[PDB]
Design a protein around this ligand. Structure first.
Ligand SMILES: O=C(c1ccc[nH]1)c1nc2ccccc2[nH]1
Length: 256
């Protein structure tokens, strides 16, 4: 064949294979098995070669997508990082890149929808690359998706908040086990929202939760400076309309 399989890196989405690219120097790639539209969109994004998204190298034809392989993801990086964890400035750098990648996507009307440490890739030189977007665990899901009310771009900024926190904590902020658990565990930290921030005509009303009050976020994210707290909270806003965008996030003072 033109590629040659070696491992599974691996499962979702659903399988991702590490493969030898025989034609191009035996380098490692990642092979992946409205369609030709999503594919078309993916090729159009490639034309911009944004440095914070995985490169698409080839499309073969049922459907095999050939992407850039990177040795680790954020999960494995947070695993192996020595105590006392990710340096403050490294967290700040990795966040900027994350939001850069995301804004690039959002600005080209692509919503990721499943951001998590497992498809945030971390290059040996420390470059952040987003993977596993543009094709078709609730700990990273936004409220509006749990509630099944809206699926616009803000959905991904909620996931960014969760990741930001986890870069400090080295463990997830919201480890729910069901949509309803997840929603519960979220409001336990951020508090019950105003009645007019609660989506209209969804199955779950505000009154299905008695998660009294907002607890100060630094109790859960020890290490976090004042500015990170501000940013993190603007990301973890209940109302998608009031949530900060990737674009505004790029200008937040936290990144001065
Ligand atoms: O290179 C990767 C990829 C994913 C999607 C497209 N490329 C990739 N490298 C990985 C390393 C560890 C865990 C997951 C990984 N996933």
């Amino acid at each position: 064949q033109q590629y040659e399989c070696v491992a599974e890196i691996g499962e979702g989405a659903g399988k991702v294979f590490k493969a030898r690219d025989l034609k191009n120097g035996g380098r490692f790639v990642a092979l992946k098995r409205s369609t030709i539209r999503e594919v078309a969109v993916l090729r159009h994004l490639e034309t911009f070669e944004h440095p914070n998204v995985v490169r698409l190298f080839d499309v073969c034809t049922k459907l095999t997508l050939v992407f850039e392989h990177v040795d680790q993801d954020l999960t494995t990086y947070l695993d192996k990082v020595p105590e006392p964890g990710v340096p403050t400035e490294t967290i700040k750098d990795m966040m900027f890149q994350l939001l850069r990648g995301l804004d690039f996507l959002h600005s080209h009307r692509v919503v990721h929808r499943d951001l998590k440490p497992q498809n945030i890739l971390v290059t040996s030189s420390g470059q952040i690359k987003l993977a596993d977007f543009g094709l078709a665990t609730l700990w990273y899901r936004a409220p509006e998706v749990l509630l099944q009310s809206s699926y616009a771009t803000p959905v991904d900024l909620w996931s960014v908040g969760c990741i930001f926190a986890e870069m400090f904590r080295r463990k997830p902020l919201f480890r729910g086990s069901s949509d309803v658990d997840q929603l519960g565990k979220i409001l336990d930290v951020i508090g019950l929202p105003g009645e007019e921030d609660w989506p209209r005509d969804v199955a779950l009303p505000r009154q299905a939760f008695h998660s009294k009050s907002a607890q100060p976020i630094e109790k859960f994210v020890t290490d976090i400076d004042e500015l990170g707290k501000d940013l993190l909270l603007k990301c973890l806003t209940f109302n998608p309309a009031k949530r900060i965008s990737a674009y505004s996030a790029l200008s937040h003072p936290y990144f001065q």
